[PDB]
């Protein structure tokens, strides 16, 4: 019985390095050799209480690739919860009697955690809970990073943009800081600075990080340039100055990048990456996105199948 069998995947902070590595391993193994009837006779819930394209479509796609069926909803507008005013708990109290695992994304922080408390012996996979966590993004992020960089340790990672509300970078920083000798550069408006709780964690783990105010300051040091979108829809009123992007990456800005460096972005992008970067040999966000398929296939196989796929 593999370590991840029947485990909720709520938060990076609840996962060992061994765990991440295990997903990545299981992953590539299935990209190598598809196993298309693995989750046959499984019905999974794709429960998106807020918009998604990449996260959802990749998940449902992965479920199919492994031979499972999908029931769900793509917004809460046409559920009992939207029109009839139902609790999340009640909502998770019934669906969990229907399906074999619940993939869900919710506008409030803590929603996936809450679901586990009502979901019974049904696992929950957190597809995004407010500005909190994004375990599955991180899993693909990792995969993409190994793919292009060779290792997950001893890297110079820069994260730029909305670091306060970006669940993507919360989960990713926690993940990377479970590996050896990584070093961070944070490029954010002061209002959307990486939260104190990630920092305090870096410090306890004795991990080098520093703030900067331009991309160039760090360009030539960077292995991974991870750009992020401003979470417009998660902002507080006193932050509306920060709606527009503060750092726009252009192709001209890539003059001094180390050759190995890839630009990542969990997507979607507004303008924080101009379309003229797409063509450079540093752009790797679409490739990154496509990696969501193997990360998620992996995760699903691991959680719903007792024994490791060979």
């Amino acid at each position: 019985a593999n370590p991840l069998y029947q485990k909720h995947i709520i938060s990076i902070n609840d996962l060992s390095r061994d765990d991440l590595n295990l997903v990545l391993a299981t992953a590539a193994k299935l990209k190598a050799n598809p196993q298309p009837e693995l989750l046959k006779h499984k019905v999974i819930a794709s429960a998106f209480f807020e918009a998604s394209t990449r996260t959802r479509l990749s998940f449902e796609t992965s479920m199919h690739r492994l031979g499972a069926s999908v029931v769900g909803f793509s917004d809460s507008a046409n559920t009992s919860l939207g029109k009839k005013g139902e609790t999340l708990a009640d909502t998770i109290s019934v669906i969990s009697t229907y399906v074999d695992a619940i993939v869900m994304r919710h506008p409030q922080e803590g929603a996936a955690r809450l679901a586990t408390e009502f979901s019974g012996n049904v696992p929950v996979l957190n597809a995004g809970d407010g500005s909190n966590q994004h375990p599955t993004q991180t899993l693909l992020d990792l995969f993409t990073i190994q793919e292009t960089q060779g290792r997950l340790d001893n890297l110079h990672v820069a994260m730029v943009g909305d670091l306060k509300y970006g669940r993507t970078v919360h989960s990713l920083t926690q993940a990377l800081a479970k590996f050896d000798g990584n070093r961070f550069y944070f490029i954010a408006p002061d209002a959307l600075a990486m939260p104190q709780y990630i920092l305090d964690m870096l410090d306890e783990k004795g991990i080098a990080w520093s703030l900067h105010s331009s991309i160039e300051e760090v360009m030539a040091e960077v292995d991974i340039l991870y750009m992020t979108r401003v979470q417009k829809e998660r902002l507080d009123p006193s932050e509306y100055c920060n709606v527009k992007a503060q750092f726009v990456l252009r192709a001209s800005d890539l003059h001094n990048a180390k050759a190995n460096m890839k630009v990542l972005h969990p997507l979607p992008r507004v303008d924080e990456i101009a379309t003229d970067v797409d063509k450079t040999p540093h752009a790797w966000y679409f490739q990154q996105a496509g990696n969501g398929i193997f990360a998620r296939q992996a995760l699903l196989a691991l959680v719903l199948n007792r024994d490791l796929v060979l």
């Binding site: 938060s11 902070n13 708990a89 922080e109 803590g110 955690r113 966590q133 305090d200």
Partner: protein
């Protein structure tokens, strides 16, 4: 000083009334004696509570390390302090506090709050079981 019971000494000024309200202390038939704003060689100005024939839990006594850190809880039997406990910070606090994150899921739903407690430089950090954000205990309000 009394027959038998509990004396909570060295509560800080303005906290005493709070704890009364908080632990529904005043909701007994027992004799209670409360001094507010007593002089205190020890600290500076102090509050002080005595409940007769009544004792505190263990966590309730630690869930007291939040507001009254350097407080001293005396267990008293037959006019003699037969015990002298101190509040040490618990691992967590449940049911009693409320997450300052307005977008925390905890607000809407049939769930008790819950926070993780770790001592920081100047304060005490509280991390909510749900939204996973961390706050100063000063920031966190009670319910």
């Amino acid at each position: 000083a009394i027959k038998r019971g509990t004396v909570i000494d060295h509560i800080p000024a303005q906290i005493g009334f709070k704890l009364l309200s908080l632990f529904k202390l005043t909701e007994t038939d027992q004799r209670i004696t409360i001094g507010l704003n007593l002089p205190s060689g020890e600290m500076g100005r102090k509050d002080l509570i005595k409940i007769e024939n009544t004792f505190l839990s263990e966590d309730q006594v630690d869930q007291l390390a939040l507001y009254a850190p350097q407080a001293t809880v005396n267990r008293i039997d037959n006019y003699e302090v037969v015990g002298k406990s101190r509040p040490s910070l618990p691992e967590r606090i449940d049911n009693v506090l409320v997450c300052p994150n307005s977008n925390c899921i905890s607000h809407a739903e049939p769930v008790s709050s819950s926070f993780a407690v770790r001592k920081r430089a100047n304060d005490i950090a509280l991390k909510c079981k749900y939204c996973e954000k961390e706050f100063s205990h000063n920031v966190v309000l009670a319910n």
